[PDB]
Design an enzyme around this catalytic site. Sequence first.
Site, PDB file in Angstrom:
ATOM      1  N   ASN A   4      16.822 -25.463 -63.763  1.00  0.00           N
ATOM      2  CA  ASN A   4      15.842 -24.774 -64.594  1.00  0.00           C
ATOM      3  C   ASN A   4      16.410 -24.498 -65.980  1.00  0.00           C
ATOM      4  O   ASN A   4      15.739 -24.735 -66.994  1.00  0.00           O
ATOM      5  CB  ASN A   4      15.397 -23.476 -63.919  1.00  0.00           C
ATOM      6  CG  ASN A   4      16.528 -22.482 -63.763  1.00  0.00           C
ATOM      7  OD1 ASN A   4      17.638 -22.842 -63.372  1.00  0.00           O
ATOM      8  ND2 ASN A   4      16.254 -21.222 -64.076  1.00  0.00           N
ATOM      9  N   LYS A  15      29.383  -7.656 -70.503  1.00  0.00           N
ATOM     10  CA  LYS A  15      28.157  -8.284 -70.987  1.00  0.00           C
ATOM     11  C   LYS A  15      27.241  -7.265 -71.651  1.00  0.00           C
ATOM     12  O   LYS A  15      26.672  -7.523 -72.721  1.00  0.00           O
ATOM     13  CB  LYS A  15      27.432  -8.972 -69.832  1.00  0.00           C
ATOM     14  CG  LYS A  15      27.923 -10.372 -69.536  1.00  0.00           C
ATOM     15  CD  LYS A  15      26.990 -11.105 -68.587  1.00  0.00           C
ATOM     16  CE  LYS A  15      27.331 -10.815 -67.138  1.00  0.00           C
ATOM     17  NZ  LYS A  15      28.597 -11.470 -66.716  1.00  0.00           N
ATOM     18  N   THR A  47      17.986 -17.450 -69.750  1.00  0.00           N
ATOM     19  CA  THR A  47      19.311 -18.011 -69.995  1.00  0.00           C
ATOM     20  C   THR A  47      19.235 -19.209 -70.932  1.00  0.00           C
ATOM     21  O   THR A  47      20.048 -19.340 -71.856  1.00  0.00           O
ATOM     22  CB  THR A  47      19.958 -18.408 -68.669  1.00  0.00           C
ATOM     23  OG1 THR A  47      20.225 -17.232 -67.894  1.00  0.00           O
ATOM     24  CG2 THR A  47      21.254 -19.162 -68.905  1.00  0.00           C
ATOM     25  N   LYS A  59      27.820  -3.432 -59.561  1.00  0.00           N
ATOM     26  CA  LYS A  59      27.808  -4.623 -58.722  1.00  0.00           C
ATOM     27  C   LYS A  59      27.658  -4.229 -57.264  1.00  0.00           C
ATOM     28  O   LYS A  59      28.393  -3.371 -56.771  1.00  0.00           O
ATOM     29  CB  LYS A  59      29.082  -5.446 -58.922  1.00  0.00           C
ATOM     30  CG  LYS A  59      29.207  -6.655 -58.003  1.00  0.00           C
ATOM     31  CD  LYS A  59      28.006  -7.584 -58.081  1.00  0.00           C
ATOM     32  CE  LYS A  59      27.687  -8.000 -59.500  1.00  0.00           C
ATOM     33  NZ  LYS A  59      27.131  -9.377 -59.552  1.00  0.00           N
ATOM     34  N   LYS A 115      24.177  -0.962 -64.652  1.00  0.00           N
ATOM     35  CA  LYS A 115      23.326  -2.114 -64.395  1.00  0.00           C
ATOM     36  C   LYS A 115      24.147  -3.143 -63.640  1.00  0.00           C
ATOM     37  O   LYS A 115      25.271  -3.457 -64.044  1.00  0.00           O
ATOM     38  CB  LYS A 115      22.788  -2.708 -65.699  1.00  0.00           C
ATOM     39  CG  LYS A 115      21.751  -3.795 -65.505  1.00  0.00           C
ATOM     40  CD  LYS A 115      20.424  -3.212 -65.073  1.00  0.00           C
ATOM     41  CE  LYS A 115      19.301  -4.215 -65.207  1.00  0.00           C
ATOM     42  NZ  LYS A 115      19.289  -5.171 -64.073  1.00  0.00           N
TER      43      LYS A 115
END
Lengths: 410, 410, 410, 410, 234
Positions: free
Chosen positions: A217, A90, A186, A102, A66
């Site tokens: 945001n 992560k 987040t 990546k 991922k």
Amino acid sequence: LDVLKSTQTVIHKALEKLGYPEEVYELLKEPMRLLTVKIPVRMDDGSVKIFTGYRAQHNDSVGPTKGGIRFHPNVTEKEVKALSIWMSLKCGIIDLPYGGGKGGIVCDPRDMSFRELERLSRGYVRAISQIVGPTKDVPAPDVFTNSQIMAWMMDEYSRIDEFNSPGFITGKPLVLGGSHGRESATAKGVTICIKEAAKKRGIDIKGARVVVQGFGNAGSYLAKFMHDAGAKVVGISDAYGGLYDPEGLDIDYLLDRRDSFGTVTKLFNDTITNQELLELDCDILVPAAIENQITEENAHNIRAKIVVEAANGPTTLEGTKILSDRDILLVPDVLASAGGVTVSYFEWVQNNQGFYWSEEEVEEKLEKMMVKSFNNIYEMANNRRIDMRLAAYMVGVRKMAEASRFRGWI
Amino acid sequence: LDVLKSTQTVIHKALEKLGYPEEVYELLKEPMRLLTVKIPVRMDDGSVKIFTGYRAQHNDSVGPTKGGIRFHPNVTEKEVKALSIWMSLKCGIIDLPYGGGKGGIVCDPRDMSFRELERLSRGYVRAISQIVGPTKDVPAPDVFTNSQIMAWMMDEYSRIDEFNSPGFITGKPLVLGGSHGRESATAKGVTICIKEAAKKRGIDIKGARVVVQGFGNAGSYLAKFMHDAGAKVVGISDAYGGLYDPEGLDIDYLLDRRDSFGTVTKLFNDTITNQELLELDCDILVPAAIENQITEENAHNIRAKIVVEAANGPTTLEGTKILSDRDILLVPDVLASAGGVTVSYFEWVQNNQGFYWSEEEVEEKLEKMMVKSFNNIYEMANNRRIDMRLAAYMVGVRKMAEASRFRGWI
Amino acid sequence: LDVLKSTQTVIHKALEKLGYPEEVYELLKEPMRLLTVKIPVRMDDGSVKIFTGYRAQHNDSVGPTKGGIRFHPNVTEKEVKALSIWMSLKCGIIDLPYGGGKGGIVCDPRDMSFRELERLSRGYVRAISQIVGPTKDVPAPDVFTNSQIMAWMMDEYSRIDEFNSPGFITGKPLVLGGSHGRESATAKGVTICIKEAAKKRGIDIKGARVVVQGFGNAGSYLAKFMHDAGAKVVGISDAYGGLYDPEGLDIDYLLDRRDSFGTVTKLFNDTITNQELLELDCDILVPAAIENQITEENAHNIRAKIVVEAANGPTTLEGTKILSDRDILLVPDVLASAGGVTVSYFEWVQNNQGFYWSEEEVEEKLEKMMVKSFNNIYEMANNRRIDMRLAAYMVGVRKMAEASRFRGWI
Amino acid sequence: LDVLKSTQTVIHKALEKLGYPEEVYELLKEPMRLLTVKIPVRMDDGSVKIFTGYRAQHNDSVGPTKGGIRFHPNVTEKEVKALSIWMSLKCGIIDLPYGGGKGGIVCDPRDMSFRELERLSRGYVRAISQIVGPTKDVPAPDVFTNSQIMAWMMDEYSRIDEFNSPGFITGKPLVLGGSHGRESATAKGVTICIKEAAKKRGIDIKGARVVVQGFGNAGSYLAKFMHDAGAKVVGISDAYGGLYDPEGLDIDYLLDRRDSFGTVTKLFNDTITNQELLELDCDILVPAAIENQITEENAHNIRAKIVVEAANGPTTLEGTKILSDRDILLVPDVLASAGGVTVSYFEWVQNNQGFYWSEEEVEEKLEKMMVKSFNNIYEMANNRRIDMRLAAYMVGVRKMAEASRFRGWI
Amino acid sequence: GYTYEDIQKYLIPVIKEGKDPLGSMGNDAPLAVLSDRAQSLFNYFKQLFAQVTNPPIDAIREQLVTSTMTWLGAEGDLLHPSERNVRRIKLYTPVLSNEQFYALKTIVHPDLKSQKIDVLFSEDLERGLKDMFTQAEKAISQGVSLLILSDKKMNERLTPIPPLLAVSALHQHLIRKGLRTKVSIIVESGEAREVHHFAALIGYGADAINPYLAYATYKQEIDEGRLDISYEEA
């Protein structure tokens, strides 16, 4: 210049603490699949430009890689590898069935155009189509990427594979298989971490004083979540300054007047600078803004019992050391900002099932996942007299090392 | 000095002479695929070692890439890319339906064992299985690699793909789908080049005063083949000096069982003139002892009407220009040493057909192909009033450039 | 309007003559796979236009379908189906391992542009990618198509399938896997048919008088072939008229002065019209020009012993009947103009093998194939007192019917 | 009159109201894939019959197409395309990750036998196997098609693909991967629509004076479900006239074992008022007896505060406008009869997961989905000041248009 | 046209005091039309004011009455508005920082599309303006909702069009052709460092401005030691 070396060092330290041999570090220090490609793109003027693309896959023992794709002119192989390793960390922290990946392209989207961007995205997808897919590598957006680019990549992959493949790429619009909560992920994760830290430290969220550095945001959603929970936000900041009110800041009105970029300050009113905003009296501090803000000088002046690194690397080693000496609970970014990755994982699951959940389902699942990760890290850091950052790194590398050992790669 | 930069420069001048835009050079200067992989291998002592591997694909417009693999510790990304470009040039010169490909592994087979080498080859194939195949990339052998390694790679790929894939890799033994003429390919190619050059010129093959700087393997083979019709004048650089100096006399056939390890052919204590003899009024020259034997100082000293290169970089640009001015024919090494690539192509064709040819068929097809390539290069060089090396480079790049333009990549 | 009905009628008549039941006609009258697609194309102005594409596959029992793609505004489903059936008939006549296929797009290439044409070709290939391939359906060029369009389609298919697929489409350039003789194929086939007919009728080619109506590429190549064989060309025609010389026409000089479009007439010199050119005294007549030229009025005035329909349908039913009454040997177009299909088949074979033949090999193979087909048709038409057209239709349908019966579809 | 043209018109007005360019309509008016196939089937008498089959795919931007198959002799290309468009509209209304699909075969199952039907279904699957699958096109049942046919199709596709593919086709039996709630799907959907409409209005479900023009299958089911809480006033169009006229009285539960074949529920000779009763001051209306029962003449005569359509085309545009002006709620049939599609989607999800739900889970998920769709349609209709039918059409086309624009097709 | 006086007496004082610098002894220099030296097109336009028939106002004291809110995007159906009328961007300040400008350029959103036009000319200013008009119309037809007039990528051969003239001409053309409401105008010019410049651009049509050259001047001053305050706060 030393990002890859630093990542290697933290991996080595985590593996040493966990007790694994040196072969595990030798395997995990560098990705086992790095692809460099040249993408010819026809521009609006009619000329042809050759762009350089990189795609790195750190590991696949746990599951499909991922990762994210960023459109920046300063991308490099070292940066791509380091960020792939960070993504693996992560995923391990959140206990996802993913590896680290990546992608990157050497380009300037500011000078590029809409059609040129579409062509570049399609070309990149074609160049890496041989090693990516819903079962191999799942990209997502990063710097100068968004749902339109993700949709272009998804269309490219479906057009290649002769059937629709929504799960190949995440970050898509809702109509194309996107997931709810992609914007507040987040902030919601930061809220969950803050609540868990307050519970651990005995601080009651009701009436707790919260300061947020950054009102984008993430900052706006975090402030709204604290206000709903009952905590009082005594300070916010934007590009023009900050405000201070110990008795509350009227988050509802601030959000109502919030513009697209998040500005809420008045014109003819003096504002509070970030340097003295970080030093305000509060129980919770949340930097979700530019990095390198906490250093030796301001570490002693910080009056927050809990500090949560919503942004990327807002604290230095000296600041962390001083906070540990002062007994201030620090929540690392690698854990706090995992909400986006978790929501992307939920989107992948929804694409696999063919069933798309709701906001409440996403909220509850994210809550359970983040709570479990935070509790595991806290218990690890209490059992071993170390810092939460090191505990998180160890938790991230443990799963990957165990999977590699079980599969027999080492 | 940089091999990659030199290759880019020669490509640039060839394209400029052919009259192509700069975007063609921008596309063809750097390969469009560069995969870097890490292979874990379990050694005989129970430990695990991580090996680094590279695979470069330069251009697939013409057809599937064809490339060799070398097991050396000094391999690098730049070297692999340059060799892929050179392979593409050779394929274009011979008019094959191939592109440029190359591979490498950082290892020391002299230290590695048989089982370790088998495991390493299998791991390399497993790592690069996604971007290789009979229709994408065809591996072949190179230095420190042989038919056993090719067979192991073939077995691994067959296991991966669930069916026999002889055409995926060349250089295999006869039982597994090999081809005849593999061993004598390069020597035969130089022989046909020499014969065609003599036929184009007024020289016949009866007298054929031949100077050779070889006498090792390829040099001995070509000398033996020449001895049937032509004659000899002097042999130089036999690993010890001018041990052979007939000076107008022939040599008895001594190719039954002899090697340079102990003496050369008869005795090491025979009279030795000196290291470098050269000179002499000969009609055929075959310099292959070391890189860059011919320089500006001795460019005018040679007295050979025809020179055929059989090694890598035996002559410099100044020497080539001097010989062209003197009107001495010069056959480039890139064309002289294409017999191995041609035989590998024949093996690939045989694997595709399922029908395996004989030595006579291989020889006649090789003769036809090399004669056609030599005639095309000679005619184009005469038309453009340039040197054979530049003509060969332009012939090699023309196919790739035209294919890319037709397919629309530029 | 009645093209499909006419094709159905000829199929019915051929099957009745061969003795097959009505189920065979029911199966072969219409294709078993017709696909209609809508292709969105972005134009230079920035707008989006929806084009309509059709692809028909008559049969696949013999092997993969073979067809062509034409870019015309008057294309229709009925025309596509009829031409697919005609292609099946041609493949059966030549004894190829192919079926019948036909593609079409509703567009005006005259108003379209280079980039728009590329985009349209790619979109069509994508729309039909699900039912086409080297093993399913092989397209080729037709009206307003050429090697560049074929290369674009090939690039599209390779970009879809992740590996190069030269055999998916024919008519490509040489650099991309094309075959030699793609330009002189039709003329060479017409020459072979003419020679065989002359041998059958006892006419000696040496000194035989040949008239060619049309001096395009096919006409020029045919005239050159007759001149080389020794026959004297006493008449040629172009867009501006024709010439007449019983003793020869200096084909070498005519070809030397031939322009791109094939004009060879002088400016201030009177020319011979086609109506009276067809009535010239000759042994061989070859219309390779516009259709509907031979009718009742000129059938009696035609003085040619052999007439070969190089073009498509240059003769009517009444003209054929009158020629049969007058004992004039007529060679149908469906047989004469099969050289292009045969060369496309050779290109497909070369792509499959990976080995590309030469002009001489293509020439000899085409000679054998066309000679065998012509002899079979002539023997059939002699055994049964029928016309060569009906014999060719029967030969075309026999293979397909037998294959369907063997496979069990009827 | 033309169903296809009517569908294009409604799509056009919906897109115009939504404010989209004309290219969106040009793309969505005609399906992008229309495959016509000929299926040879060996009948029980030893003969061979050729059947015609059609498969239409309208838009794959949202996801794989989902479509039913009907075995009728009156099917046509235009009908299949229109039904595919309608299926796409239904999927968009329910917010499914599906596109528009449909299929048909020209046959008479009443004449065909069991084995003949099996062979025909297998041949249809074999013919369309290239463009269908769990990721491309999901078939389902329609008129004259059932779970046995679905099972045969599933078996054929599994044999073709060499592995079990339950999710390729829906409507299967439970043992093969079927789902609960298939039979009562439509009736349940109308019940939830009625309940949500009543909740939105001020009407309760206790009194609920209900008029029904059904009493056959679906009408009887909905009447029985209503009887638990609500009441009845009159039932009309029971295949014989106004056989039921309680006029303010309820009906005893008589759904155990009864059918209209012999009498209706008790006796055919009971008192009959007339064919059309209507009128009466009721609060719920369910017209489903024939197409276009409501017209301009009787539009103002009805006295129902809520109308829920349960048949195809029960009301005209003038009637819909009149009811909207009178402020009577009107639930479109396209939304009322989506329960079957929703249950098929649930079956597809269960096949993908490998986990099969229960009746309670199916019911609750159906309730959630239909309630969400109804609320969205009602809110958008209120916001735009338009009718529910137009609101539903716009909601259906919005997803497709946005997906196409995001993917870049327009 | 930057000058050492301009910098040291308008840019540094602005940072230091948070207000436009004061002065005394009003202009004694000649007008632009009368000055021998070349002058910017801005100096040819003079601000008007409310003398009679309408009074001025005190913005600081009556801030509750003022509003700097700006809308970027395409207006919806005014007569029948619903939802889409507010599906646009809104800013509290027309002045755009470099990061905000980059974000707007890289939005990519199909509903919110942007196109960049280089307002440069060599010999024919009318020709340059007409090419700008054609590019704007083409972008509008393609669906673009943001037009970014840039003076960048200018060299000795290509000189930038006066941004005031360019903005006014484009505004008038779009108003005449009924397309102004479908787009918004962003300016990226180096000749924008003064309140008068910004006010003129806004009043003649500019929706937003980006003084990249002024930001670069501030960055240079910070780097060379002066102006200790950081780039972001500046």
